[PDB]
Design an enzyme around this catalytic site. Structure first.
Site, PDB file in Angstrom:
ATOM      1  N   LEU D  41       0.710  -1.097   0.016  1.00 47.23           N
ATOM      2  CA  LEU D  41      -0.035  -0.039  -0.034  1.00 47.23           C
ATOM      3  C   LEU D  41       0.841   1.215  -0.023  1.00 47.23           C
ATOM      4  O   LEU D  41       1.924   1.105   0.422  1.00 47.23           O
ATOM      5  CB  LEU D  41      -1.003   0.112   1.203  1.00 47.23           C
ATOM      6  N   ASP D  42       0.530   2.435  -0.474  1.00 51.99           N
ATOM      7  CA  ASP D  42       1.032   3.714  -0.872  1.00 51.99           C
ATOM      8  C   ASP D  42       1.272   4.340   0.535  1.00 51.99           C
ATOM      9  O   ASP D  42       0.606   3.941   1.258  1.00 51.99           O
ATOM     10  CB  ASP D  42       0.566   4.320  -1.902  1.00 51.99           C
ATOM     11  N   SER D  43       2.475   5.240   0.384  1.00 52.16           N
ATOM     12  CA  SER D  43       2.684   6.072   1.581  1.00 52.16           C
ATOM     13  C   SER D  43       1.603   6.973   1.955  1.00 52.16           C
ATOM     14  O   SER D  43       1.746   7.223   3.318  1.00 52.16           O
ATOM     15  CB  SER D  43       3.872   6.822   1.183  1.00 52.16           C
ATOM     16  N   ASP D  45      -1.670   6.298   1.904  1.00 53.07           N
ATOM     17  CA  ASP D  45      -2.349   5.402   2.795  1.00 53.07           C
ATOM     18  C   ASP D  45      -1.651   5.142   4.106  1.00 53.07           C
ATOM     19  O   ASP D  45      -2.341   4.674   5.108  1.00 53.07           O
ATOM     20  CB  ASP D  45      -2.857   4.291   2.141  1.00 53.07           C
ATOM     21  N   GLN D  46      -0.295   5.039   4.089  1.00 50.97           N
ATOM     22  CA  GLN D  46       0.488   4.719   5.410  1.00 50.97           C
ATOM     23  C   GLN D  46       0.297   6.107   6.409  1.00 50.97           C
ATOM     24  O   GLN D  46       0.204   5.655   7.539  1.00 50.97           O
ATOM     25  CB  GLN D  46       2.059   4.554   4.906  1.00 50.97           C
TER      26      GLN D  46
END
Ligand code: PC1
Ligand code: PC1
Lengths: 128, 95, 176, 87, 52, 220, 119, 459, 73, 65
Positions: D41-43, D45-46
């Site tokens: 998952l992308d940063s 969403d992080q």
């Protein structure tokens, strides 16, 4: 949709919209790197003087002593009486003094003339 | 980005040391510390006695001292002290 | 103004903008469901032009994004009661008595607490024994004349404790 | 305030509110897994994940740390460090 | 501007009061004489009120 | 006196709107109440102002104590954002807040009726500054609307507060104190405000829409 | 009310200025109508220590209300009808003051427009 | 009064032929016995003063200041160790004997019948203080401080002698009664104006007023605690005492010629309260506080109301106690950390839990707490100056606001909020320092119960 | 030291504001919410909380009966 | 046992605190009812505020013109 955010001397310019941060020279990168180097060396020297179990007293911060002797004793040198310094000195030193002196002369002359006529409310004015 | 592994290892040594210190900070010998009507009576009788002794003799021998705004008397009353009536008010009408 | 680096990154600056705008939209937008709608709208607005291969166009959109954010911020944002400016923010700074003290007690009070003072004595011996050679050799062995960073190396040579650990381990409990 | 907390509680609650999130799966979710590397998952969403832990446990963690958590083991470790979760 | 507006409307109020349509408070004994400042026998001032 | 009171009343009434902490709302509310008492001294009615001191004192001591109960029960998050669902989360403090923020406005025969509405009646039936009347009127409407908003965001909405909840009132001293002050703010306003010697002339002869206007403004 | 709008928008004359109320003299259309009984017995009005600006018409009802309220104290709700009577007498006083107001208003309007239009 | 002069002499060879580590106990015990015997003086009644000779006599202005001197001696003689406890036996005995000799000339000065004798014992008080602050100043500009002290106080104080000799040989003797009972008005000539300016300007130097006040703060931040407390309390209140006595002559011309000194005192009181709001160097705040309060005293003396003189002597005694105590707390914090600064020594609510009470109580006696004597003095000065003019009360209340502001900032700066956690040398508070604080505060509160003592001649 | 930690999947996206807003945003064309972290706020002893006039008119469930008894007395 | 925290659920309630809450709200409403109808009715004027004074010309003193 923006009123451009005019700054002032009290509303500080925030770190987001400089907008000089977004067109960058390489010399500013060098400056930020060397500034990080200076703070890293100062924290290294501080932490090595900070965690000695043999050390007892204070850490003797030289910047605080330097600022204190800069603020108290090193004002009088350097100094030369300039036109700006003399003007601002005779303004802030004598001006309001002679103003309040004029208004006390005015109030006392009115009060003594008025009680020489006697038309004050001293029907009983005991605790003078 | 993420951690550099130096930070991971240094952080793990501080995890072991911080947990051992914070587990040590409990004191537990299971003997942790060791040595090497009357209210209403006293506080509604003793200051009442002291003040009411203070207010009779000292206070009412000083003459201009405790003074009371007088009881209002009404035209139907009678004075308790000497004994004499106060004349009543006259006829009421046109209300 | 950060310990490990000098400049943040470009991506780090966009990321801080995203967290600040999303937090201010939390504070602006109560009932949490219209919040969730507007937050996914913001996430989509970042997604629509995330994949632009330039760099000066990236900093262009970033700068105009800060303009159109600072237009629309919130006056009193909901900051948590541990953040600076918050409701508590070292509420319990009244009771963070540091542990360089507690050695200046009378020995009768030291006779009230035997085990904790004995274990503090062994921790203090562990401090004094492993201070000079190991920590000072690791601090004057690996750096250059300019340190140029503030991350300090772990102790991985053979044995004992990491360097400069005492006033980081022995800090108060933050809820005393 | 009288809450009790332990490492078991913070571990289970962080793994719980990471399990509830949409675009990952509870099938392959260990305690020890990265976010960008294997969950994928992308940063952006992080940082939404970090926002979820901040909004749950009730205290900010800074972006000087929020660059570099990336895995729920270090999340559990860092919030256990901030709250000092021992007796 | 807001403080100037509030003080301007207070001045407009101070020149233009409101009042309910009502005469004076009629006092019985010479505009309540002898319970003003005094002069017990100096000035009995003749003033009366009439029923309307 | 009454120019300053009207200025304070409108200023802290408008300033009380869009405030998202509890205690700052309550501070702006008590500043508006002291504004009404300065209006009450501007009109020649000091004894009504003293009656308002007494009833106001009971009332906002009870309100502060209830909000402090909630704030310590909810881990001191203390803010109106992230506050919502508390009705039926044991509703003793919600009963306290609805009795309170009911009693802040003019509710026709409760404790907050007597003082505040005799104040606005004697303020309207006098040779007044003709703008201070309008300021107190508009600020009575404003205290109605922030009372409604503190009720709505504190008790009614969807619950927005983080999990692992330990909301607790099984507690002797808390319910005894809130009990004692609700018994206070229900009866003692009338008990105080009735058996006193009349030190002024009550007005008591108003037209229509001058006695009704308190309830009219609070309802609108 | 409406008197305020008429007095601040219309003419300057026919709405009378308050707190300078007696402009026309009394007994202008009275002749021989005055009672002003004042049955309050001023010395006993001094005896009951009333507040100033209460020593007025309709004060005997205040005396009776104070008498019953003092003489029956632990009944919290003892005196109702005499306090009602005192409010009724002050209502009569307020009605009489309003009658004085509109008397001077109607006199001023009709008589002054008579005089300054037929002069 | 000879029964107070001669045991002050006899307490001096006590210090010499007492043995090692026994000079301390004997001097402290015997000076406290002298303090009780001093408190036995307070006999003064009604009509006259009391005459303890044609040489000594006591007005009721001189009684509380004399008891203040003989009470501030043992407090100081205990206050001045731990910064000379490691020094030599001979230098230690010399320091203690120097303080005893300074007490002797202060008693000489406060029970001075004649103004010539008053001038001689005035500068006899001036002599040992230079030796004390120069030999134990513990900083590098103590030479500059002692030298400015010397030449300011002489060069202001010196034509006062010429004016006193002229009064001596134009009107006979200079007993205060025969200077009184005979004093004739002196009209608006110019020689009378210069005589007035000489006398009043000498004491203007001594108080100080604003144009001559940099005399003071170097002599407090660059001086030991003994010289600091005696200097501030007894020397400034002795200057005020002297002006109170000499202003009985020159009755008509003070109305003509006393306007600009009132002016410089008021505006400099405001500027001095403003300058002690932003400074570092914790010791200096109390010094400029003393300048502000004695400018208030000067306004009170130069207006000539009995309310003003009662408020003046009350303000003198209360501020002497408060400023001496607050100097002593500043030295206690300086012995804790060798700083002298203010932003460094932070924290100290967590650590040292009892010292907060003394800081707070001294800051409230400096705040003009309302039952205290300080507010009694300031309040009567405000009453008298509003009788003087209806407009000058703005400056008094603005002084009041700024005084509360800087005093409470001085409280919440050093002792409020966070230890700097790199200090780790401060020990818990000794019994000596708290004994000194209890010797300061408790007479002030017990005078706050019964202040009929400290109100002066016009009671 | 159990807590018993009531598990996931025992709610769905059925809290009706979340359901309507996912329908509106799916018609918008995104379909990527945070989703299921709020259904515990929208079910349980929650979910039909009382409105505003009901909370103030909560008094007379016991009130009119005692009022009629006191009037009839 | 006393109360315990519970996770992601509506909390439990003792019947005592909720029955005192219902009792005190019901007595507040009972007081405003019995203080409304029975004894005061102070929201009405309680005296008829009249018209303009009497609307009677030639009375109160005016001459015909
Ligand atoms: C100044 C220079 C330094 C002086 C150092 C020593 C100062 C000692 C001051 C002690 C003051 C005590 C005042 C006092 O207690 O008065 C009795 C005070 C005030 O009383 P009073 O002094 O007003 O009068 C009482 C008079 N008799 C005893 C006859 C009734 O008494 C109390 O406070 C009652 C307890
Ligand atoms: C400052 C110097 C003060 C000198 C002493 C005061 C004095 O008398 O000065 C007047 C002296 C001169 O005045 P005088 O003291 O000679 O006064 C003479 C007085 N009659 C005229 C009545 C005889 O002037 C100065 O000292 C000038 C400086």
């Amino acid at each position: 949709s923006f009123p451009k955010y005019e700054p002032s001397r009290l509303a500080s310019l925030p770190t987001t919209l400089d907008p000089a941060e977004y067109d960058i020279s390489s010399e500013t990168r060098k400056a930020q790197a060397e500034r990080l180097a200076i703070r890293s060396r100062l924290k290294r020297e501080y932490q090595l003087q900070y965690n000695d179990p043999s050390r007892r007293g204070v850490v003797e911060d030289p910047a605080l002593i330097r600022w204190t002797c800069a603020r108290s004793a090193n004002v009088y040198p350097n100094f030369r009486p300039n036109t700006k310094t003399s003007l601002l000195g005779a303004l802030f030193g004598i001006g309001p003094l002679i103003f309040w002196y004029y208004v006390f002369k005015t109030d006392r002359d009115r009060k003594e003339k008025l009680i020489q006529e006697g038309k004050l409310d001293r029907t009983f004015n005991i605790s003078y | 980005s993420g951690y550099t592994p130096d930070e991971k290892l240094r952080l793990q040594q501080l995890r072991e040391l911080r947990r051992r210190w914070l587990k040590d900070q409990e004191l537990s010998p299971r003997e942790p510390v060791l040595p090497p009507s009357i209210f209403a009576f006293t506080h509604v009788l003793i200051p009442v006695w002291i003040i009411h002794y203070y207010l009779k003799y000292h206070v009412t021998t000083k003459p201009y001292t405790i003074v009371e705004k007088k009881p209002r008397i009404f035209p139907g009353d009678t004075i308790l002290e000497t004994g004499e009536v106060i004349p009543p008010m006259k006829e009421f009408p046109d209300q | 103004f950060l310990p490990s680096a000098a400049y943040l990154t470009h991506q780090q600056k966009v990321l801080q903008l995203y967290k600040r705008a999303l937090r201010h939209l939390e504070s602006r937008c109560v009932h949490r469901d219209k919040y969730r709608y507007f937050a996914c709208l913001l996430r989509a607005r970042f997604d629509e032009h995330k994949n632009e291969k330039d760099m000066v166009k990236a900093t262009q959109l970033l700068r105009e994004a800060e303009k159109e954010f600072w237009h629309g911020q919130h006056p009193q944002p909901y900051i948590f009661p541990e953040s600076p400016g918050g409701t508590s923010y070292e509420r319990y700074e009244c009771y963070k008595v540091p542990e360089w003290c507690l050695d200046d007690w009378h020995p009768s009070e030291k006779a009230m607490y035997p085990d904790y003072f004995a274990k503090r004595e062994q921790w203090k011996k562990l401090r004094r024994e492993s201070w000079e050679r190991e920590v000072k050799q690791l601090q004057e062995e690996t750096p250059v004349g300019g340190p140029r960073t503030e991350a300090l190396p772990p102790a991985r040579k053979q044995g004992d404790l990491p360097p400069l650990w005492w006033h980081i381990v022995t800090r108060p409990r933050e809820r005393p | 305030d009288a809450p009790p907390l332990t490492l078991e509680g913070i571990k289970d609650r962080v793994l719980y509110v990471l399990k509830l999130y949409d675009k990952i799966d509870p099938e392959k979710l260990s305690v020890n897994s990265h976010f960008m590397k294997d969950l994928g998952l992308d940063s952006l969403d992080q940082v939404e994940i970090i926002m979820a832990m901040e909004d749950e446990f009730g205290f900010e963690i800074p972006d000087i740390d929020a660059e570099k958590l990336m895995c729920p083991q270090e999340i559990v470790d860092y919030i256990a460090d901030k709250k000092d979760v021992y007796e | 501007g807001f403080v100037a507006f509030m003080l301007f409307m207070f001045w407009v109020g101070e020149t233009y009061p409101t009042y309910q349509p009502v005469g004076p408070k009629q006092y019985p004994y010479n505009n309540l004489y002898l319970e003003r400042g005094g002069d017990p026998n100096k000035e009995p001032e003749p003033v009366v009120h009439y029923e309307i | 006196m009454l120019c300053l009171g009207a200025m304070t009343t409108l200023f802290t009434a408008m300033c009380a709107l869009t405030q998202n902490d509890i205690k700052k709302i309550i501070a702006f509310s008590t500043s508006s109440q002291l504004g009404l008492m300065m209006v009450t001294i501007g009109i020649n009615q000091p004894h009504l102002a003293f009656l308002h001191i007494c009833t106001h004192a009971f009332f906002k001591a009870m309100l502060f104590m209830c909000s402090g109960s909630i704030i310590h029960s909810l881990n001191d998050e203390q803010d109106i954002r992230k506050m919502g669902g508390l009705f039926k989360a044991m509703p003793f403090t919600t009963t306290a807040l609805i009795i309170g923020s009911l009693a802040l406005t003019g509710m026709p025969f409760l404790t907050g009726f007597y003082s505040k509405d005799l104040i606005i009646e004697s303020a309207n039936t006098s040779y007044t500054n003709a703008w201070a009347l309008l300021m107190t009127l508009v600020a009575t409407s404003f205290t109605a609307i922030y009372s409604t908003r503190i009720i709505f965001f504190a008790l009614l909405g969807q619950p927005r507060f983080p999990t692992l909840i330990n909301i607790n009132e099984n507690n002797p001293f808390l319910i005894n104190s809130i009990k004692r002050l609700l018994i206070g703010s229900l009866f003692a306003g009338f008990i105080i405000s009735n058996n006193i010697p009349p030190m002024t002339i009550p007005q008591m002869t108003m037209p229509h829409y001058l006695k009704m206007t308190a309830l009219t403004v609070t309802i609108l | 009310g409406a008197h305020l709008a008429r007095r601040y928008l219309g003419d300057a004359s026919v709405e009378p200025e308050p707190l300078r109320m007696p402009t026309f003299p009394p007994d202008y259309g009275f002749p021989e109508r005055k009672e002003r009984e004042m049955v309050a017995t001023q010395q006993e009005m001094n005896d009951a220590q009333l507040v100033l600006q209460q020593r007025d018409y309709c004060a005997h009802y205040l005396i009776r209300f104070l008498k019953c309220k003092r003489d029956s104290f632990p009944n919290f709700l003892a005196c109702k009808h005499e306090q009602h009577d005192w409010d009724y007498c002050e209502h009569l006083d307020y009605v009489k003051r309003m009658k004085e107001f509109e008397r001077e208003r109607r006199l001023l309007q009709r008589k002054k427009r008579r005089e300054q239009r037929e002069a | 009064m000879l029964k107070y002069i001669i045991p002050t002499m006899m307490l001096m060879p006590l210090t010499w032929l007492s043995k090692n580590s026994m000079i301390w106990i004997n001097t402290t015990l015997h000076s406290l016995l002298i303090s009780l015997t001093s408190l036995l003086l307070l006999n003064q009644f009604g009509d006259n003063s009391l005459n303890f000779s044609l040489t000594f006599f006591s007005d009721s202005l001189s009684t509380p200041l004399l008891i203040l001197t003989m009470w501030l001696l043992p407090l100081m003689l205990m206050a001045s160790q731990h910064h000379l406890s490691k020094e030599n036996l001979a230098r230690k005995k010399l320091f203690i004997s120097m303080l005893i000799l300074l007490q002797l000339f202060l008693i000489m000065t406060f029970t001075a019948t004649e103004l010539i004798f008053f001038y001689i014992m005035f500068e006899a008080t001036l002599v040992p203080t230079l030796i004390i602050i120069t030999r134990w100043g513990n900083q590098t500009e103590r030479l500059n401080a002692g030298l400015y002290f010397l030449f300011y106080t002489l060069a202001g104080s010196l034509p006062l002698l010429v004016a006193l000799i002229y009064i001596q040989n134009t009107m006979g003797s200079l007993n205060f009664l025969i200077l009184q009972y005979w004093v004739q008005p002196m009209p608006n000539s110019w020689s009378n104006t210069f005589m007035w300016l000489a006398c009043m300007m000498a004491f203007m130097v001594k108080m100080p007023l604003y144009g001559l006040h940099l005399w003071l703060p170097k002599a407090h931040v660059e001086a030991p605690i003994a010289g600091s407390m005696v200097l501030a309390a007894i020397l400034l209140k002795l200057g005020g005492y002297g002006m109170m006595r000499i202003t009985l002559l020159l009755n008509p011309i003070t109305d003509f010629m006393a306007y600009p000194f009132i002016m410089l005192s008021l505006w400099g009181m405001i500027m001095t309260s403003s300058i002690c709001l932003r400074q570092t160097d914790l010791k200096s705040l109390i010094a400029y506080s003393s300048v502000s309060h004695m400018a208030l005293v000067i306004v009170a003396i130069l207006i000539q109301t009995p309310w003003s003189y009662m408020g003046a002597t009350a303000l003198m005694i209360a501020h002497g106690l408060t400023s001496s105590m607050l100097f002593c707390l500043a030295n206690s914090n300086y012995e804790r950390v060798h700083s002298r600064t203010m932003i460094l020594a932070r924290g100290l609510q967590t650590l040292l839990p009892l010292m907060a009470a003394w800081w707070l109580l001294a800051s409230l006696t400096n705040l003009a707490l309302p039952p205290s004597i300080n507010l009694i003095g300031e309040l009567f000065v405000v009453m008298s100056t509003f009788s003087w003019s209806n407009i000058t009360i703005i400056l008094m209340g603005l002084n009041m606001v700024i005084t509360a502001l800087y005093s409470l900032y001085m409280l919440i700066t050093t002792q409020r909020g966070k230890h700097t956690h790199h200090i780790n040398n401060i020990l818990p508070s000794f019994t000596r320092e708290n004994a000194l604080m209890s010797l300061h505060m408790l007479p002030l509160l017990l005078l706050s119960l019964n202040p009929k003592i400290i109100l002066g001649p016009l009671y | 030291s159990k807590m018993e930690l009531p598990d996931y999947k025992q709610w769905k996206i059925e809290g009706t504001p979340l359901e309507t807003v996912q329908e509106k945003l799916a018609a918008r064309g995104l379909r990527d919410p945070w989703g299921r972290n709020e259904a515990w706020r929208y079910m349980g002893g929650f979910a039909n909380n009382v409105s505003f006039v009901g909370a103030l008119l909560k008094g007379f469930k016991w009130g009119f009966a005692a009022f009629v008894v006191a009037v009839g007395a | 046992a006393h109360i315990e925290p519970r996770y992601r659920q509506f909390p439990q309630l003792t019947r005592s605190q909720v029955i005192q809450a219902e009792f005190f709200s019901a007595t507040m409403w009972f007081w405003i009812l019995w203080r409304f109808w029975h004894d005061s009715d102070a929201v009405l004027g309680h005296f008829p505020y009249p018209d303009p004074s009497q609307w009677t010309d030639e009375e109160l003193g005016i001459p015909p013109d």
